[PDB]
Amino acid sequence: GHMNDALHIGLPPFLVQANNEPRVLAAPEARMGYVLELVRANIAADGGPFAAAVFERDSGLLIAAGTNRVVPGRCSAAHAEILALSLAQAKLDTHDLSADGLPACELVTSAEPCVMCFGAVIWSGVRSLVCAARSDDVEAIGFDEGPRPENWMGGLEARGITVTTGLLRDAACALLREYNAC
Amino acid sequence: MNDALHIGLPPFLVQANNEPRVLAAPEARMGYVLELVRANIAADGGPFAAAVFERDSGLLIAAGTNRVVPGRCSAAHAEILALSLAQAKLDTHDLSADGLPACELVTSAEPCVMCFGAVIWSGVRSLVCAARSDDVEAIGFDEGPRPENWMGGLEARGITVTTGLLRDAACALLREYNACNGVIYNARC
Numbered sequence A: 001g002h003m004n005d006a007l008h009i010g011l012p013p014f015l016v017q018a019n020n021e022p023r024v025l026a027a028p029e030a031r032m033g034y035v036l037e038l039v040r041a042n043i044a045a046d047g048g049p050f051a052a053a054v055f056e057r058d059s060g061l062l063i064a065a066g067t068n069r070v071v072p073g074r075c076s077a078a079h080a081e082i083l084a085l086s087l088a089q090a091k092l093d094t095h096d097l098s099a100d101g102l103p104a105c106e107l108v109t110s111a112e113p114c115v116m117c118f119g120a121v122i123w124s125g126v127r128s129l130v131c132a133a134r135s136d137d138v139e140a141i142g143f144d145e146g147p148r149p150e151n152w153m154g155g156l157e158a159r160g161i162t163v164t165t166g167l168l169r170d171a172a173c174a175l176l177r178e179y180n181a182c
Numbered sequence B: 001m002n003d004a005l006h007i008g009l010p011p012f013l014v015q016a017n018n019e020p021r022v023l024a025a026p027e028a029r030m031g032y033v034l035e036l037v038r039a040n041i042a043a044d045g046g047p048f049a050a051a052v053f054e055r056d057s058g059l060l061i062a063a064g065t066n067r068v069v070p071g072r073c074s075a076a077h078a079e080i081l082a083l084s085l086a087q088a089k090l091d092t093h094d095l096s097a098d099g100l101p102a103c104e105l106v107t108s109a110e111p112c113v114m115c116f117g118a119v120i121w122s123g124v125r126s127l128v129c130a131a132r133s134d135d136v137e138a139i140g141f142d143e144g145p146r147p148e149n150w151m152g153g154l155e156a157r158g159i160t161v162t163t164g165l166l167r168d169a170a171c172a173l174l175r176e177y178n179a180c181n182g183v184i185y186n187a188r189c
């Protein structure tokens, strides 16, 4: 967390490992499945039951991944979505993931996004959003999605970002319920 | 870097977060926050800055500015930096955890939806704004789809909202960034 010449949030070995080991997950469920492997790695690593990762929309090349590091990280903005997006733009040398020349980018996340991440996804340059758990599922193990605009789906769809949900919802709920059990 | 989320801080901003400072009046706080806007514009950042202060002493805790382009991080808004460096200095994700004083977030402009959310989770009890949502939209920058009545939305969470403070100077710092935003060299910039 704390430094001075920088805002710095360190990552546990699995996340570091996920962001630096090559991986091509073509099918949507292959991406989501790997994202769920990370959620579980995260709990084991003292973090919230959320993970996400930016892949290139068509190939399924993993660019970056992120998990909740809010508590261990002392940073309320360290939602899975934020780190996965920001680490993706680091790796690609741009703040906009849809700058000319770059292959289309997808953020595959374990749960639907909270208001904050909802904004993050918009500015990010990402061209699609694939979720696992619904917002009900999320705000039924204690996590708050916050006041999003009515029709946040349409809001994202209305700027070149296509939304999908429920994908491997059940397996993601298994994961949610286990955390909430403990 | 791919080993940590790392947004680097320009020397002036390291200084801001280095040097102690107590600004009691709201105008005193917003004034410092707008020093940092023009300072940022001169360090390749966007026309936005923010600071976390102790609401009831005016002790500067931490400061932030748009480091989007130079940091290549669409998430690196002033608010996010200000709030995060405040959380890191104070050793907690929750700026309102027991033991810590009430925190205030002083921003040079009304927050976009992302930072609107950031505010809700930050821990801050109060957000003081300079430039109105309209002012920021006028020169291009997008606020994004904030929920209808986000202001009351925040106030309902015990987070107090104040906007338009030093709006004038805020507006002036916004236009001079615009007037020096193009690519053709204007030596006056």
Ligand SMILES: Nc1nc(N)nc(O)n1
Binding pocket: A048, A050, A068, A078, A079, A080, A111, A112, A113, A114, A138, A143, A144, A145
């Ligand atoms: N409140 C909340 N919601 C989600 N989807 N993810 C996190 O990390 N927090």
Ligand SMILES: [Zn+2]
Binding pocket: A079, A080, A081, A113, A114, A115, A116, A117, A118
């Ligand atoms: Zn979030």
Ligand SMILES: [Zn+2]
Binding pocket: B077, B079, B111, B112, B113, B114, B115, B116
């Ligand atoms: Zn913002």
